[PDB]
Each structure stands twice: as C-alpha cells, then as structure tokens.
C-alpha cells in the first residue's frame, strides 16, 4: 500500500466533504433550521481541522461558513470581547470576493445592526463600545446621536433592520448555493435519490 | 426545490462520509498515527450526530470506531468510573459480528490487559476493582493470585501482553479495512489520484 497515494485520496475526499458541508450550511441558514446549522457547522469545523493546507477556493469556503456562523449568532450577546456581528464584519471584508453594490449593502447593514442589537437588548454601554470600534476616525454623525439619546426605535433602524440585513445576506447565500450546487458529493448523492424514485 | 429530496441526498452523503471516516480511522489506528486518529475520530463523531437514524450496517461501523477509540486510550487511566479497556470489552461483545476464534482471542486479551495496565501504572486497588467488575461469579483463579501478590511481571502477562492484544486487534482492523476499501467515497477519491499520476 502506498501511504502517500492514500493520504492524497483522503485530501481529495476532505475537499469534497468541505464543499458538501458548506452547501448544507447555506441551505440550513436559508431554511431557518437552527439545529441542522449547528450540527453541520460542527461537522465542517472537524473536516477543516483534518486538512493541513487549504487552497484559495477552500479558504473562501471556510470563510463563508465562519461568516454565516457569526450572523446566525448575531442576536446572542468566547475568546474575544468583540460582538458576533463585529466579527462577521471582519470576515466579510476579508473574504476574497468582488466588492459590488450587494457587498457594500451587506457591510453597512451589518455595521448598523451591530449597534442596534445591543440597544434592543438594553446594552447601551455596549452599543457605545461597538460604535467606537466600528467608527473610530458616512452614518457616524446620525448613529452617535441615536445611541446618545438611546432612541432604539429610530426610523433609521426600521429601514436598516435585522430582516433587511438578513434578506441581503440570504440573497448572497443563494448565489453561493447555486455555485456549489454542482459539487461532486451533492451531485453524486442527488443522482442516487433520483435512481430510487 | 424539494426539501425532502435534498435531505435524502444529504443522508446518502452522510453515510458515504461515515464509511470513509471509518476507513481513515482504521488506517490511522494500524499506522500508529495518533493525531490523525484523534482528528478523524472528531470528524466521525460530528458526522454521526448529523444522522437522525442509522441502519444495522451503520451501527456496526460506529461501534467499530468507538471500540478503536477505547483501545487507543487503553493505557490512559470521563462520564463513568469504568476503564477504557473495560469499555472496549462492552463494545466488543455487543458489535453484531461472528464470535469466531479471533473474537474470543481479542476478548480474553482485553480482559487480561484491563487488569495488567492498572498494575503497570502502580494502581493495584484499581486492578482489584477492574477484576471484580470483569469476573464477578477461566483465568480468574490465576488473575486473583497475580493481583493479590502484586506480581506485575508474571509470565502469564508476558504471553497475553499489550502487543499480543494490539496485534490481534490490528489483524481484525485489516479485515474491516479490506471490506470498506471498496466504499464509494474512498474509491472515487483514489480514482482522481491515479488520473493525475
Ligand atoms: C476554523 N473554523 C472553521 C469553521 C467553520 F465555520 F466550521 F467553517 N469555524 C472555525 C473556527 C473559527 C474561530 C472560532 N471557532 C470556529
Ligand atoms: C456517538 N459516538 C460516535 C463515536 C465515534 F467513535 F466517533 F464513532 N463516538 C461516540 C461517542 C460515544 C460515547 C463517548 N463519546 C463519543
């Protein structure tokens, strides 16, 4: 047995499992299946840990899974003092993707919602700390005012709402879902199902 | 999109990942790759948690993975007071397999080694507690004597040694390895490697 050619096959299968788990994480996120998302995320992290080295494509995949995990935990709320949406905002800006009108839309919605979710939980000191971390040198003039006067139900927040953020993210998720829908593992699995029907 | 036919495909792929991870756990166990075994075991447990229901074949697979994890931790040495080899002995007796001459050989070696590893760590009280749990109503007359006189280097233990146990287990592992070597995921992965060479 050639240990090298066996490890090479294990690496090909690890990459195949990663793409399938990303696709399952995207669908669970879109479908609102919380427990399924939690279980699939655990499987993806374990598969990723087995891989010693990742390609640029695989890095993009794991970063999407990490971004979705953070968005899923936004209203919850580890190793750092930053909030889950602030953490999603760092991932979002570092994913190797085109910075189109949808990228900026999601980015500003996450920035706004990182503050709004603190205010809605009654954490006004945290909203102030999140604000200074996100804006420390376009909407800063308005947000500082809203946070200062503790106006949780300002009309600005009703336009840039959690649902508005969640819909823009869910439409980004649908593009990733169409791109990876043709990956090896899911395509081979769907073929088996159709053979039984 | 038919949510039912998507979940069906996800279940087919989960079963495919389980067989591949079992095969990778068997090879890592046989190869002495401790860290690889640890990482693959973590991946297998996460995949198993995603599956709501398992077939008899899949139950046999997870039980082999659990048995190997326990054997790997035998000289270490959670939720119970039983030792890892005592736990391997419960799995061994409940795996749906033929009780051949190799089954009884592995069983008696595990029974003997569950006591011997306690004595070798200087845990003579634990060796006595393990003995009464394993024998509480063939070698009991001899083992009680060896444990009573704290004879860690008795010739009985040199015949039924950790290596003797480990070799019989490694030859069982090789039969499982030949049986699952033809599973979908590993066979498809190996085909890709040969296409590149
Ligand atoms: C490394 N990694 C991969 C993933 C996954 F989302 F599953 F893709 N998640 C993590 C880590 C990132 C830091 C916090 N803990 C989890
Ligand atoms: C359920 N399960 C599956 C496996 C695996 F070995 F990965 F196959 N291990 C467990 C559990 C068994 C009880 C102790 N903790 C781990």
Swiss-Prot record, chains A, B:
Keywords: Acetylation, ADP-ribosylation, Cell cycle, Cell division, Chromosome, Cytoplasm, Cytoskeleton, DNA-binding, Isopeptide bond, Mitosis, Nucleus, Phosphoprotein, Telomere, Ubl conjugation. Signal peptide: none annotated. One of its GO terms (cellular component) is nuclear telomere cap complex. Changing residue 29 to P: Diminishes telomere binding. It is found in: Nucleus; Cytoplasm, Cytoskeleton, Spindle; Chromosome, Telomere. Coiled coil: none annotated. The modification Phosphoserine is found at residue 148. Induction: Expression is tightly regulated during the cell cycle; levels are low in G1 and S phase and increase during G2 phase and mitosis. Changing residue 59 to R: Loss of interaction with FBXO4. Residues 1-197 are annotated as: TRFH mediates dimerization. Phosphorylated preferentially on Ser-148 in an ATM-dependent manner in response to ionizing DNA damage. This is Telomeric repeat-binding factor 1. It comes from Homo sapiens. The gene is TERF1. The chain holds residues 62 to 268 of 439 of the full protein.
């Amino acid at each position: 047995e050639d240990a090298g050619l066996v490890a090479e096959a294990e690496a090909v299968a690890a990459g195949w499992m990663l793409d399938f788990l990303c696709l399952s994480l995207c669908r669970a996120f879109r479908d609102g299946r919380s427990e399924d998302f939690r279980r699939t995320r655990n499987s993806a992290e374990a598969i990723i840990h087995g891989l010693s080295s990742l390609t640029a494509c695989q890095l993009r995949t794991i970063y999407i899974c990490q971004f979705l995990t953070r968005i899923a935990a936004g209203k919850t709320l580890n190793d750092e003092r930053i909030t889950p949406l602030e953490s999603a905002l760092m991932i979002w800006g570092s994913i190797e993707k085109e910075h189109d009108k949808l990228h900026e839309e999601i980015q500003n919605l996450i920035k706004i919602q990182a503050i709004a979710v603190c205010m809605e939980n009654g954490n006004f000191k945290e909203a102030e700390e999140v604000f200074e971390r996100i804006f420390g040198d376009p909407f800063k003039s308005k947000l500082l005012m809203i946070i200062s006067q503790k106006d949780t139900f300002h009309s600005f927040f009703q336009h840039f709402s959690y649902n508005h953020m969640m819909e823009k993210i869910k439409s980004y998720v649908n593009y990733v879902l169409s791109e990876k829908s043709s990956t090896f593992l899911m395509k081979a699995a769907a073929k088996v199902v159709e053979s039984k029907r």
